[PDB]
Structures are given as C-alpha cells and as structure tokens.
Design a binder for these strands. Structure first.
Lengths: 46, 82, 525, 51, 49, 404, 51, 51, 49, 115, 263, 67
RNA sequence: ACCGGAGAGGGAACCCACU
C-alpha cells in the first residue's frame, strides 16, 4: 500500500500513492527508483 | 505381371528394407499378431527386425515398373540385404 | 609549406599537392579529407629534437601540447593526395643514416608504425607474428569480449549489458592500449593456458576449463537485461499498472502474480524465472484485459533495480533491470587475442587438471592442433612473454614493430627464472600422477569471454505456438519457434531417399491440414 | 562443339571440361555424377543449360 | 523558434563540455566515455562515416 | 534423431544418431563425425530433428545412420577419419620405438569394447615384459583385414632398393589377417582417402563393426595420449641458428639475383621470352627467383627440423597443417599476392610512400623475407594484411555463387 | 493449489537450506524455483517448510 | 519446399570422445521438452503407465 | 553489398595509416565496412578564400 | 540451466548401489566392478594395489564418461583365486597401508616439532 | 601380494606449508594422496548467504561469492560437525553450521573497507584467518563503501570438501614431484641440457639427467602442501589420509554386503 | 572491479594482498619486490595482483542510489 | 462443476552479429 520510492537526485524516501504524477516533493526531480524488497533472498556462495 | 515374368532384382533394396521394417513395426505397435515367438523384447522395431530376419513378415511389396505395370514380391521370397 | 608549418594563413588540415611530371598543383580545403600526422624531415634530420621531447615530457606544467608541437613546425597532417608526392621513412634511426644509399631524399617520417592499426586491432599482442585473417578475426571478436563496458553501468538502465566480475589488464600489452584506456576498462582475464592434448575434449578448436578456477570466479560474469513499459491510448482504453486480479481481469496466464507489488511492479531484489510477471499492466475492456510484460522464457535471473518516471507525453514510464550471473559452463565461447576462438568442451576440477612441479594447474587447455594451420605465432610469443612478465614483475611489452624484443631475448629472460627457456614445462597427469612424456607448453595468456553463451542459444520445440497467416511453427528462439527444414535439407532427404521422412517433416511436423475438394471440379468445396 | 561435331561429341567434351575443373584441384568425383549431369543436360538433343 | 536539433554528447554545446571528472561523476556520467553520439528516445545513436 | 549442420551440401550432412543424455547444455558429437558435418566446435550450432512416427524412425535407422553413411557415393571414399588429436597420437603410438608397461597395456585394453578379454603375448618377454603400440592396434583392428598402405615420410628409393619388405623407417603400413605387422599409421592410412584402412574395414566387415572400430581407436588412443602427451610451443618453431644463417644467405643471394635481373632489364640487356612481353617476362623471372628462394628456405627448414618437433609430429601425421606452414613459420612467410601478381602500385608508380618510385625489388612488391618468428616489418605486415584480405573477401563472395 | 507462489525452504535432503518459490505443486511433489541457482528443481512436499 | 518444423532443437556443439559415432549428447532441458509418441501395447503398458 | 566485384572490397595501398588493415567484419561486408586508424584524422573543412 | 548439482559427483540417489558386481563371460575368473559416485581418486589406487597381487591376471579401471559419475574395474585372477576376494584383499591391504602411513606421518610431525 | 611399507620424513614444517617425502609407496597411492589433498579434505566455508541490505556497488551474488571464498579457521570443529544433508535438524543448527553476521555502514567521508574482520561468528573458534599473525598484515577485503552506503547480511557456514566447490579447498599449492632426475624417463627431454635442475635433484653441473635404469619404479614422492589458512598444513595431510581410509573402508563394507547378499 | 579473494589457478588468498601491495608500491619497492615481499612465489599468484585493475575506486565516485 | 487450466504473444522495415 505505501510503496515508498527513492528520488534519483536527492535520494529522499517520499510517499506516493497509485495514479499520481511521478514527482518528488522537494527538488522537482522526475525519476524514481523503487526500493529493495523485504522478502528473503538466499544465495549460494558458488 | 505373372509369376513367370519377373524382371526386377531378387534383392530387397535398402529402401524396401527401411519401409517394410517401419510399416511392420508400426503394426506390431498397434498390437498386430506377431509372426515370430519373442523372448521378452518389448520394442516393436526389434520385433520387426526379428521377423524380417526369420522371413515371416506378412507383407508383400508392389514394385511399379516405369511403363505402368507392377510385380508382387513377397518379403519371404526375395533376398534380404543384411 | 612554410605558411602551413607556422599556421599563418593556411590551417593544418589544408593539403597542398604538387604533381610534377604533370604540371598541376592542387590545393584542397574541403571537408572529409582523411589525414594523419607525420614528422618533418629536412636534409636527413628530423625537426623533432631533444628540446621538444624534454619540454613536452614535463607536460601539465609547461602545457607544451600537441597543438604547440604542430605550431613549432615539427609535424604536418598529410592526406592521401599529399602522401602520393612525399617520401616517408619507417624509423628515423634505421632509415636516416650513412650506408648503401636507398633514398637519401626523405621528406617525412612516421611517428610509430603501430599507428596504422585501428582500435580493436591495437589490442593484439605481437600482431605481426600472426596470419592476417587471425588478426581480422581478433579485431571482430574484440567487440564481443565481455568486460566493464562503462564505469556508470549501474545508473545506465540498458538492455543486453554484460560485465565481467574480475577484468584484468593484460600481462603483456602494446604501448597503444594506454591510449585506448584498455588498462582501465579491460575485457578478459590473464589465464594460464597449457597448449596440450589432455583428454580430447578440445580436439576440434575447443578448450578445457578448470572447474575449480570457475568456482573461484574465473571468467564469471553477470548479464543485465532491462525491460521497459509505458502506460497510456484511446478515449477510454486507459493503460494502468496494478496487480491483475482474477475475478476482475479476463485474460491471464498460469503465471503467479503475487510477486508483483500492488502498483503493478516487482520490488528490486526478488528472484524471478521464466514465465513470471514483471509489470502488471491492464487495459480497460469496453471487465479488463491485461497487457502484462512477462519475463523472457528461460532467463531465470534476479531483479536489480526498478525505475519509474514520466516520458515526454507525461504518462507513467517504468524500466526494470534484471541481474543474471553467467557461470562459465561448457559450450561458452572463449577466445584469445589472436583469433583463436573456441567453446568450452569440458570442465575438470583442480585434481583432474594437470599440474607443474608446483601446484600450478592450467586454467585453460587448448588443442595444439589450432596453431600450425592458423599460424598464430603471436599467441605462442604472448604465452611466453606472459610467463616472463609474471615472473619478472614487469608488464610485458608487445608493441608490433618494437624490434627491441624478440623470441631469443624473451627466452633468455625466462631462463633466468628457473624455467625452460622455450616455455615448456613438465606437467604431471592429473588422474594417474605419471608425468606426461612430452613436456607441456604453458604460460599466462590473455583470454577473453565472448557474449555467445550457450544458454542464450539453446532452444527446442514440441508443437508450440503457430503463425497466423500460414499455420506453420513460429520463427525465433524467443517466440518458442521451430527450426527451418530448408530447401537444402529437403534436397538432402531426397538424396537419402527418405520420402516418408520428408513427408513427415514437411507435412505432419509443420502443418497437417485437411480440405474438401469436389470430384468434378478440382476447386475447394 | 555443338555447332561443329554434334550432341554426342558435346556430351564427351562437356564431361572432359567438367572433370578438368574438378580434378584440377586433385580432388576426385565419381564418374557416376559427371555422366548423369552430362546426360540430363544433353538428353533432349539440344544444349539444355541449367538455368 | 524553428525546432530542437539533436545534439552530440561531449560536443562544444553539449552540457558535458569541458566538465571535470568529478563533475561528470556527480552527473552520473562516465569520465572515460568518449562521447560523440546522440541520445534520441533514450538510445545512443552513432553516425557512421 | 537426425542431426545436421545447417549448410547441408551433401547427404553426409543430415545423419542419424542415437540419443545419449548428458548433463550440461550442449550437443556432443563424436570427433570423427565432425568431418562430414564440416563442424568446427568454434561456436557452431547444429539443429536436431526427432522423427515422430515409428515408421520414419525405422526409416532413419535403416537409411541415414552415421555408421551406414561412412563411405560416400560422391568419390567412393570414407568420409569420417581419425582426426585432430587421435590421428597424431596414432602416428606417435604405432611408431617402432613405442613400448607399453603391463599396467599401461591393461589400462589401454580396458577401453576396448571389441576385446575378448585375452591379453596378447607381449612383443618382449625378457628382461621384462613390454608390449608395442602396433601390438595393441592389432587388437584394435577388427576381424581379419588385409591392406597395404604407405606412410607420409616413405622414401621413394626404398621400394626399388633393398630393405623393401623390412622398412628401416617403419613406413609401408602392412595389415595382415587383421593384425598390424609393420608401418606407422598416418592420414594416408586412417583418414578419408580411398583404399585406407578404415575403407577396407568398412568394405569387408559391417558398418556396425567399423563404428566400433572408430570408437575403439578414439577411446584407447586418447587414453594413451594421457601418458604420451602432445603439445606445440615457441621452441617448436626455432631453428639451430645455423639454419638461420643458411636461410639468410639464401635470401641474400636471391635478393642479389633479383637486383641484377632488374639491372639487366634497365640496361635493356634482358631479351623478352617468346610468347611474352618484356614486362611479363621480367615478372616471370622475379617470380621464379623468389619462389626458388622460398622453396630452398623451406627445404632447409624441414631438414633442420628435429625428430621430436611438434610441428613435424602434426604435419607428418596429417592431422593439421601442411609442409609449407612450417616454412612460413620458421624460414620465410613468402611473397604476398593480390590477383596472382605482386602487390600493385596503389600510389603513383609505387606501392607505399616508404618506397622509391619504380621499385620492383622484392621488399617493395610484397615479398616477406621474414618469418612469423622474427616478426614482420611494418611494410611486410601491411602487405600480408592486404594479401590475406583477398582470401577473406573470396571466402565471403564465393558462397553466394556456389550455393546458387 | 495452496502452495503455489509460496516461499518455501527445503528442510531435508541434498538441497537443504535453499529458499525458493513454488511454481507447480501436486499431492506428492512440487517444483521450486531456487533463488540462488539458475534452475528450477522438484522436491517432495514433506521436504518443504514454508517461511 | 522448406518450412519450420516441430520437434526440433538447436544449440552449440562441443566435442566428446567418450561416445560412439552413432551417439549424440543432448541436454536434459532439450530432452525434457521434445517428445516422442509411443503407442501403448500390453508389452509396454506397465512401463508407460509408470512414465 | 552481395556483389561479385571484389575490387572495392580489397585493401587498397592508400589505406596505410588511415584505415586499419586488420579490422573489418567477416560477413558480407568485408572491406566495405572499415574502421579508422589511431592517428588518422578527418579534415573538417574551411573557407579557401 | 542444465548444470548438474555440485553434490552429484559423490552422492548416491535413493535406490542406487555404491558397488555393483557382474561376472565377465568372455574369460573365466573375470569380473566387472561398477562403482558409483567414485572416480580416479579410488580407481587408480585400487588398480595399482590389484596389480601387486601375483594371482591377478588382469586389473584395470576406466571412467566411461567424465560427465557421468561411474568407474568400472575389471579383475581377472588365476583359477583357485576369486576376483572378489582379490578386490577385498587389495582394499584391506590399502587400508593397512594408509593406517601405517597415518601413524608414521603423525610420528614424523611429533619429532619435527622440537626434535 | 600384500601392502608395501611407506615411510615419511618432514623436510620443512611451517604454519603456511608442509614439505615432506614419502618413500616405498606406489605412484597411484601418492597421486591419490595428492588428489584427496585438493578434493576430499572437509573444511568449513559459508554456503548460505542472506543479504538484508546491500547499498554497495557490488551486487548481492558478487558479495555472496566473495564471502564464500573467504576461508574459515576450522582445525577441529570440522571433524565434530556434520554435513547439513546428514544432520537430523531443520535448516540450520550449531551441530552442522556456523552463523555469521555482517553489519557495516559507512557514515564518514572516508572510504570504508569492509574486511573479514567485520564478520562476527557465533562460534569463537570458527573464525576467518585474521586469528593470529604476530610472530601487521592486512585482512581479506570484501567490498569498499562510499559515505552513506551499507550492507547487512547473515550467513551460515557448512562443512564441505573441494569436490563440491573450490571454496572448500583447504590447500593452495600442492607441489607433487617424483624422480626429479629423469632416471625412469617417464618424460623425454629433446634437449636435456636446456632444462633446469629440480630442487630435489642430486647431480653435478656436468650431468644433465640421471642414467636410465629399466628396473626402476617410482618412489621418493616429494610433497609441498601449502595451506590456504583454514586448516593447518600439518593437519591437512592427516585429514586427507583419514578421509581416504574411511572412503576405502566404506567401499569395503559395501562390497562385503553385496557379496554376502549375492551368496 | 575488486581484487579476487583467491587466485584462480592456485587458490592462495590474494584478497588481503591488494592494499599492502599498493602501500609497498607507494615506496621505492618495484612490483617484482612487492610481490615477493607479500610472499607470492608462483607466477599464478603474482599475476593476480600484477595484472589486476581496481575499478571499485572508479565505481565509488558515483553517488549511491539511497542515503 | 464456482469460470471450462484461458497459453497462439501483430506484422513489416532496417541494423548488428554468429557458423
């Protein structure tokens, strides 16, 4: 539901809902990266 | 043509050997009665090979001559290559 | 020439050409003339001097740059027209001296003959010791060797991005690599190759790899593929990113959609596989129909990062990049810097691999039967100089026309470090332990890993998807297509005389169909 | 040769010239195929060029 | 206003002209990138001579 | 399954095969089968068709299986031969001075599928039991095959003179009653030539038996190669430094001869050959001198070549390379040709701007007096690149005509 | 099934300790997309333990 | 004359000296995708049932 | 392309030091697609006035 | 995706047998020993220890395919002597050799440490 | 028809390597010892890596691979542990695994080097090879962090041997050499004068190689087993010998069971 | 990118030798003296540091994705 | 039966590359 994103420029975690323009509440920068997931990752060292 | 007038080779060519084996092993695969007592082998291709070696395949070959005539050669009656 | 050498009125790019036997004297100023810099030679002496070299060696403080060197009247730009009417010398020392006279009337000299090469051919060590088709093939495969292609590859959301874990600058290099910045972004690893016939799994131009080295990270890389999607297109058919819900949306694959977040995308760091939804996109149905993007079949990677933004139309735009590491397996195409390509044939562990008197087991074993017809003597000299360099501590020099290094000098240098002067060593069999009767040629050589992995080429089919116009199997690995039983394969089957197999290939295995035709007229009914 | 000597001499000369290029490399091709090609190219009384 | 002309990277009117390596890294650009190509629809284009 | 490499040129390009399941993700085919398919394993891809109806499966089995496709009807020769390590290792194995220990003989015989489990009496019983390579290849050879072949290095005068049937060089391969009596097996014995040992095997015994013959040869010889070993190195390409002096002398006298021919042509002292003009007869003299020099340097190279050399160990076996490859590696690369002539005058009456105008000398027109070991001077490197470019262009252009 | 799309952990056998996602599942076995390797392998449901 | 066909695979070839000339090594991924249609018979009925 | 006239594709003598002799694609573009030598520079044009 | 698991090289499947014994019909007193999930490490020492027995007429090993994990040991012994007992005597002599080697190596270590 | 009597003498003992000679044994036995040295000596290395956060510029599987290649000091715990495939427990317990934790965040403007010192084990005796180097040397680097970057992970260490993966290879260089002077002539020198003398050779400068003896048999096997740092070089050989002996004993047990079931 | 933990051929630990190698090169030591001051006797291990390019430093010049 | 496992997923053009 929250789906916190990351600004490309100022690296600020900012709340965005669904069906909103991709905007950062500061710096007006328009490219967002999502996050790292919460589910478990298991890597063999091979 | 009559049995007296047979001009084709008495050797079963490689194409006849391939197609007869295929079409007889297909029949064995559709549960046709085998002509040779098997020793427990289950593969229809090997069953057809054994029947060909024993000269028991219940199939004859119609060799069409170029003029339009034909000859009926029984598999038991012509020489197998291998 | 006097004005051009001082840049008074005539700029350097302008070329003046005097045809002498035919009285024309032509001056060219237009664009597109291809030219290269050459030194200026008076009576028999260069205008380049110790003072020029000294004041230019202390650059970044005296700022005596190439432009100042041109302004000094030391070098000129000579195009082909002016190259016809000029006399060059390959090397000032060897071609401007008192001897049995050849020309004694030189006009220009070349800075270094190795500059006749390009970019991909300037990374070839000892390129004059190879057959030219080998050099051409290496220049072609240098564009396919995987490495750090750019420093900002993580911000660069790009499809088909290939980077190697542990790139290395070559132990033996040309003096022209420092200008290609190849020692800053290299593509390859300095492997220890043993040119020997070990088991036979490298016979036809193939190669054995060390399984233990691959486990340790030898030629291990990661494959970046990026997926883009944008929502929109009609009056009411609005595209939207969301999780498609079964009771609402009509058309759905068996793929599991729980991996998506409720905004319709996967969070970075989630394991993904073939036929797994990545971008959940649905279009309103005048309930709804999805246009979700599925991960390419048999990719089986991990999402690296997910970016959302707005395109120039102001619509939501998403690009997703997926990591997938490619551990070197058998069949992966490997090549050297001499046009000696080859796919891995088998991977033996360190125990199974031959070894020296020490514990040195070759990372790579190639067939010796690849040298004599290819005649890549540059490969052997590279393998020798690599051992010499790795023992000396120096970086080997493989300038093409150096003439200051040769096989005899390299052998004499190697003999000082406790090795056979010709690079051969006494390897022991990895299985039996008996020392190999012949002595094995072994040494560090710069091998490259090409993009032609086998997991990106392998595909099969068993009654998959079908084209729309003619009901034949689709074409392409991505579309789960079928191979083409072409006109020459048809001819080969005719020659075999397999008519039933030909009909099976072209009729049942492609497009069996039944039609009804009238007996009176041969027209379809 | 077709204009001067006739179709049968054409077959033999064509066989000779077709074998000359193959055996120039030192390679061998069985006479079966050369004979069949020169026959099917000249089985109609005229020079049936394969186009 | 006549239009917008696509512009080549690292050119004399490109925004990366003469920038130092630290600034290029600040702009998430590769200092080793030679430039000489156009970015059109977010795809690098290179005019072959 | 039927299995082909896509550029199918003849019916030995689509050949049947029995499927064996192997772990990794690559097609694996036996190395003798490489020759018919024209495979290279240098990134080749081959596509595999599975016959679906049992009738066509049996048809493939009885018609297009690779053991049945050994001998071509194209040139009545076998198509598959011992190749690319196994051939060289057979040449090294069937030499006269090859002796195998008791354990080594057991290890090798363990890889024979057509072995009766009976260990042959060794060729030497005392002081200590040792077998011979021919003694194991005799067990390898199936049935009772009788053939006589000659090795690559078989001298001509040997047959005329004495020692005809007792070969000092162990040439004149003689197989009798399915047993290798004498002779070193090479390309001309186990290859794709007419009347070879494999050809006799296929014509006498069955196609399945010849298949087993390939399998046994390759397995046992590749497993003896684990002990023998075979390489190639930079020392294999070096000469005695007296051969270097001989080659330099030959090159120098050839250059002096070319210079004096140029002098005779310039002073109008050269009479044109009948049927030729002055230009082409001068070209003929220059080409004759350069070719004679290259041949003499090559022959000096092979004479200097040692018994233990890996280049010779490959070329004599015929697995890879030719007798001119050694000459181009060690003695002289040769004279570069473009359209049969010397390197043409691209510039104004000269070849490169480093050469004086109207320079017909060997260095100025493409002759490379350096080998692949000494490296090429930049002019020679450019000329060799230009010469190889012609062959590379021909390779691409020829296909669109040959396939059509 | 219920197990489809559920992150499981192989708690018995040679693949013990691997985290994956169930692609297909039966009464007997289930196919697990392994997070670590590039490979989807099938194990018994008695060997799986969900997260 | 030529057309796409079902039941066909394609991948990279690599040498292997440890199998006969009539054998070809194929990956488990290819073998697990391409199928052959066997007709049931009382001979192979149990084997095919288990399969 | 796909033309049987090999004369344009051949490496010309005037390619010394301005076009790489080794580097060219092996497909149907042999000699037609050629890269640029290292110090080879292409003139940009100026007024002859 | 066809890469076999790394543990496949030494781990038996359920129902697999570590050793399989088949009589060789070609010659008398001969037997084929098929060992699963072993390799040269064991085959070479087994063959070498078998070759020391004067009552062994034939002894050798092979790996049919390096991708597969099998090794075949063929043993032929003199009559009145069995290949099975030859194999077990070779194994029990090799085990004694290894135990004695362990004892001597640890003794050598102890005397090397301040001795 | 019985076993031979081998003898061993140590020529050099060091925390880094052991160099010694084995006499009166077979070439196959010596090679199998050299082979178990690389393949069948179990050690402790991490095989299960869970990354809770990774803001570094090296991706997750890169970090996991570099972590797995890190050796762990397992001198006696490897004997008392169990393979995770053999332990009766669930995913992991202390009886078959060792837990590792790594929580490093870079906050200052200076570049932070994430090293093996930053790995915290749950077992104090199973640690990386940063244990003792007194009688200055650095530690194994994992990744470098920029200001604001961090990574958090939890790892488990399993017991394995070098046949699975090269990270369970306890030895770095296993020098193997027998018959340093070519008395048996198992190899053939085309020019013996050009070949440098071996370290174990006993020949004057005048002589190039030992005279051939047809009666000779390979003996006097020279080893130089160099440890990577996980096991001691002296205990690597003991563990390899024990592993080969138990493997032979297991094969003998299986053979005896099969024979007694066949009869 | 970064120095490998172990030598590909030998397997000897090389991951801890890179910073010390750079420190030694930040002195009168040549490469040939630094390598065997670090204890690299085999050229397999020597090339691991001799031919290594340390691109992680060029990678760290870019600002991270987060803060 | 609560949906029925729905998978078929345009095409043309050009470019690069592989054998």
């Amino acid at each position: 539901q929250p789906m916190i994103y990351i600004c490309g420029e100022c690296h600020t975690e900012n709340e965005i809902k669904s069906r909103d323009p991709i905007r950062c509440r500061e710096c007006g920068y328009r490219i967002m990266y999502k996050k790292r997931t919460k589910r478990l990752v298991v890597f063999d060292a091979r | 043509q009559a049995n007296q007038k047979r001009i084709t080779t008495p050797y079963m060519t490689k194409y006849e050997r391939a197609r007869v084996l295929g079409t007889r092993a297909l029949q064995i695969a559709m549960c046709a009665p085998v002509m040779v007592e098997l020793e427990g082998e289950t593969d229809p291709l090997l069953i057809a090979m054994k029947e060909l070696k024993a000269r028991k395949i219940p199939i004859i070959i119609r060799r069409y001559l170029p003029d339009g005539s034909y000859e009926d050669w029984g598999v038991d009656e012509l020489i197998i290559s291998d | 020439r006097k004005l051009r050498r001082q840049m008074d009125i005539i700029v350097s790019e302008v070329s003046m050409i005097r045809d002498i036997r035919e009285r024309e004297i032509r001056i060219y100023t237009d664009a597109g003339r291809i030219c290269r810099p050459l030194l200026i030679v008076e009576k028999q002496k260069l205008l380049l001097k110790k003072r020029h070299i000294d004041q230019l060696k202390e650059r970044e403080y005296n700022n005596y740059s190439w432009q100042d060197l041109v302004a000094s009247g030391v070098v000129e730009y000579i195009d082909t027209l002016e190259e016809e009417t000029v006399m060059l010398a390959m090397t000032p020392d060897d071609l401007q001296e008192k001897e049995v006279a050849y020309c004694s009337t030189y006009t220009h000299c070349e800075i270094h003959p190795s500059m006749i090469l390009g970019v991909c051919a300037s990374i070839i060590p000892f390129p004059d010791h190879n057959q030219s088709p080998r050099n051409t093939y290496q220049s072609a495969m240098g564009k396919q060797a995987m490495g750090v292609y750019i420093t900002n590859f993580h911000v660069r959301m790009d499809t088909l991005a290939h980077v190697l874990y542990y790139p290395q600058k070559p132990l033996v290099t040309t003096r022209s690599m420092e200008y290609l910045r190849f020692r800053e972004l290299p593509a390859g690893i300095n492997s220890i190759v043993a040119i020997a016939s070990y088991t036979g799994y490298n016979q036809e131009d193939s190669v054995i790899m060390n399984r233990s080295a691959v486990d340790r990270g030898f030629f291990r890389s990661v494959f970046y593929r990026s997926y883009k999607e944008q929502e929109s297109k009609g009056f009411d058919q609005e595209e939207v990113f969301e999780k498609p819900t079964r009771e609402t949306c009509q058309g759905m694959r068996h793929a599991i959609y729980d991996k998506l977040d409720d905004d319709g995308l996967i969070a970075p760091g989630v394991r993904v596989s073939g036929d797994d939804v990545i971008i959940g996109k649905t279009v309103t149905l005048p309930t709804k129909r999805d246009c979700s993007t599925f991960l390419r079949t048999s990719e089986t990677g991990i999402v690296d990062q997910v970016m959302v933004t707005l395109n120039q139309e102001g619509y939501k735009f998403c690009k997703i990049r997926v990591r997938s590491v490619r551990i070197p397996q058998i069949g992966d195409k490997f090549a050297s810097r001499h046009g000696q390509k080859g796919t891995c044939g088998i991977q033996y562990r360190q125990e199974d691999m031959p070894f020296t008197c020490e514990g040195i087991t070759p990372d790579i074993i190639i067939n010796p039967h690849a040298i004599p017809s290819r005649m890549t003597i540059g490969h052997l000299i590279e393998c020798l100089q690599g051992k010499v360099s790795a023992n000396k501590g120096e970086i080997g020099d493989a300038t093409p026309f150096n003439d200051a290094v040769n096989v005899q000098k390299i052998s004499n240098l190697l003999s000082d470090y406790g090795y056979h002067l010709r690079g051969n060593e006494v390897l022991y069999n990895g299985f039996t332990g008996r020392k190999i009767t012949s002595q094995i040629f072994i040494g560090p050589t710069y091998y490259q890993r090409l993009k032609h992995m086998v997991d990106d080429k392998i595909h099969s089919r068993a009654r998959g998807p079908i084209q729309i116009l003619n009901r034949q199997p689709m074409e392409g690995r991505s579309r789960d297509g079928g191979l083409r039983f072409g006109e020459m394969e048809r001819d080969c089957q005719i020659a075999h005389g397999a008519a039933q197999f030909l009909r099976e290939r072209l009729f049942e295995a492609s497009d069996p169909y039944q039609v009804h035709v009238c007996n009176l007229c041969g027209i379809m009914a | 040769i077709f204009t001067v000597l006739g179709i049968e001499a054409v077959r033999k000369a064509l066989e000779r010239e077709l074998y000359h290029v193959i055996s120039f490399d030192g390679s061998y091709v069985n006479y079966r195929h050369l004979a069949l090609l020169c026959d099917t190219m000249t089985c109609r009384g005229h020079l049936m060029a394969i186009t | 206003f006549i239009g917008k002309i696509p512009i080549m990277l690292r050119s004399t009117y490109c925004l990366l002209n003469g920038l130092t390596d630290r600034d290029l890294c600040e702009l998430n650009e590769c200092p080793l990138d030679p430039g000489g190509y156009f970015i059109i629809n977010g795809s690098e284009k290179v005019l072959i001579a | 399954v039927i299995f082909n490499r896509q550029p199918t040129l003849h019916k030995m390009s689509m050949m049947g095969h029995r499927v064996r399941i192997l772990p990794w993700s690559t097609f694996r085919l036996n190395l003798s089968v490489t020759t018919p398919y024209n495979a290279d394993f240098d990134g080749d891809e081959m596509n595999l068709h599975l016959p679906q109806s049992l009738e066509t499966r049996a048809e493939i089995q009885e018609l297009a299986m690779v053991p049945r496709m050994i001998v071509t009807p194209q040139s009545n020769r076998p198509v598959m031969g011992i190749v690319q390590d196994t051939l060289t290792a057979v040449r090294k194995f069937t030499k006269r001075d090859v002796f195998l220990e008791r354990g080594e003989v057991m290890n090798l015989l363990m890889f024979l599928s057509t072995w009766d489990g009976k260990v042959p009496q060794p060729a030497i019983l005392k002081p200590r039991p040792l077998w011979t390579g021919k003694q194991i290849f005799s067990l390898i050879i199936p049935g009772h095959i009788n053939c006589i072949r000659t090795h690559s290095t078989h001298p001509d005068d040997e047959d005329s003179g004495p020692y005809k049937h007792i070969s000092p060089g162990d040439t004149k391969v003689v197989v009798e009653n399915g047993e290798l009596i004498m002779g070193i097996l090479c390309k001309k014995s186990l290859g794709t030539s007419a009347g070879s040992l494999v050809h006799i095997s296929y014509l006498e015994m069955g196609h399945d038996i010849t298949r087993l013959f390939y399998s046994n040869i390759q397995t046992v010889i590749n497993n003896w190669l684990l002990i023998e070993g075979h390489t190639i190195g930079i020392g294999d390409s070096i000469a005695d430094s007296k051969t270097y002096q001989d080659i330099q002398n030959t090159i120098k006298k050839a250059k002096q001869d070319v210079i004096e021919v140029i002098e005779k042509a310039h002073n109008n002292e050269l009479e044109p050959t009948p049927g030729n003009t002055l230009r082409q007869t001068f070209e003929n003299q220059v080409n004759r001198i350069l070719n004679d020099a290259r041949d003499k340097t090559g022959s000096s190279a092979q004479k200097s070549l040692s018994e233990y050399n890996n280049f010779k160990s490959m070329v004599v076996s015929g697995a890879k390379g030719s007798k001119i490859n050694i000459s181009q590696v060690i003695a002289v690369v040769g004279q570069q040709n473009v359209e049969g002539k010397r390197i043409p005058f691209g510039f104004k009456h000269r070849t490169l701007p480093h050469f004086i105008k109207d320079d017909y000398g060997p260095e100025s027109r493409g002759f490379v007096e350096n080998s692949y070991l000494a490296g090429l001077t930049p002019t020679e490197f450019f000329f060799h690149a230009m010469g190889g470019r012609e062959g590379l262009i021909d390779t691409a252009v020829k296909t669109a005509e040959t396939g059509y | 099934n219920e197990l489809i799309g559920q992150t499981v952990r192989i708690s018995q056998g040679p693949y013990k300790g691997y985290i994956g996602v169930v692609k297909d599942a039966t009464e007997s076995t289930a196919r697990v997309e392994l997070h670590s390797t590039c490979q989807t392998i099938s194990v018994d449901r008695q060997r799986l333990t969900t997260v | 004359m030529g057309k796409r066909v079902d039941f066909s695979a394609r991948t990279v070839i690599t040498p292997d000296p440890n199998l006969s000339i009539d054998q070809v090594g194929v990956p488990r991924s290819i073998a697990a995708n391409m199928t052959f249609a066997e007709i049931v018979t009382p001979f192979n009925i149990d084997r095919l049932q288990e399969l | 392309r796909d033309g049987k006239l090999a004369k344009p594709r051949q490496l010309h003598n005037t390619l010394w030091g301005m076009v790489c002799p080794a580097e060219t694609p092996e497909g149907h573009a042999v000699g037609l697609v050629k890269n640029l030598a290292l110090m080879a520079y292409i003139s940009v044009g100026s007024q002859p006035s | 995706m066809n890469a076999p698991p790394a543990f496949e090289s030494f781990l038996l499947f359920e129902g697999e047998k570590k050793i399989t014994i088949n009589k060789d019909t070609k010659v008398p007193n001969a037997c084929l020993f098929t060992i699963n999930k072993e390799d040269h490490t064991l085959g070479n020492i087994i063959k070498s220890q078998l070759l020391k027995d004067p009552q062994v007429l034939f002894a050798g090993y092979k790996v049919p395919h390096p991708l597969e994990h099998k090794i075949i040991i063929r043993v032929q012994t003199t009559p009145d002597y069995s290949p099975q007992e030859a194999f077990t005597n070779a194994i029990t002599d090799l085990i004694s050799e290894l135990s004695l080697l362990e004892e001597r190596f640890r003794v050598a270590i102890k005397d090397k440490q301040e001795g | 028809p019985y076993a031979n009597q081998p003898t061993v003498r140590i020529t050099e003992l060091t925390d880094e390597n052991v160099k010694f000679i084995i006499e009166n044994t077979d070439l196959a036995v010596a090679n199998s010892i050299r082979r178990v040295f690389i393949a069948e000596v179990p050690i402790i290395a991490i095989d299960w890596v869970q990354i809770d956060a990774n803001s570094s510029v090296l991706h997750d599987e890169f970090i996991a691979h570099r972590l797995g290649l890190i050796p762990l000091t397992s001198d006696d715990i490897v004997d008392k542990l169990q393979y995770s495939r053999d332990c009766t427990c669930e995913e992991f317990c202390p009886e078959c695994s060792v837990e590792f934790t790594l929580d490093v965040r870079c906050n200052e403007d200076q570049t932070r080097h994430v090293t093996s010192r930053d790995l915290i084990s749950n077992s104090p005796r199973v640690i990386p090879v940063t244990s003792r180097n007194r009688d200055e040397q650095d530690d194994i680097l994992i990744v470098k962090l920029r200001k604001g970057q961090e990574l958090r992970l939890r790892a488990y260490a399993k017991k394995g041997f070098g046949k699975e993966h090269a990270k369970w290879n306890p030895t770095a260089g296993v020098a193997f050499e027998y018959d340093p002077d070519n008395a048996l002539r198992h190899t053939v020198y085309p020019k013996p004068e050009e070949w440098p003398k071996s370290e174990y050779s006993e020949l004057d400068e005048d002589e190039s190689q030992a005279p051939y003896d047809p009666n000779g048999k390979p003996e006097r096997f020279y080893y130089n087993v160099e440890s990577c740092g996980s096991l001691r070089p002296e205990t690597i050989v003991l563990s390899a010998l024990s592993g080969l002996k138990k493997k032979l004993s297991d094969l003998q047990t299986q053979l005896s069971h099969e024979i007694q079931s066949d009869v | 990118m970064i120095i490998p933990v172990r030598c590909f051929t030998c397997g000897k630990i090389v991951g801890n030798k890179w910073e010390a190698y750079l420190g030694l090169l930040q002195a009168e030591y040549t490469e040939g003296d630094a390598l065997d001051a670090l204890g690299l006797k085999r050229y397999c291990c020597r090339r691991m540091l001799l031919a290594h390019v340390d691109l992680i430093e060029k990678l760290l010049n870019y600002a991270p994705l987060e803060k």
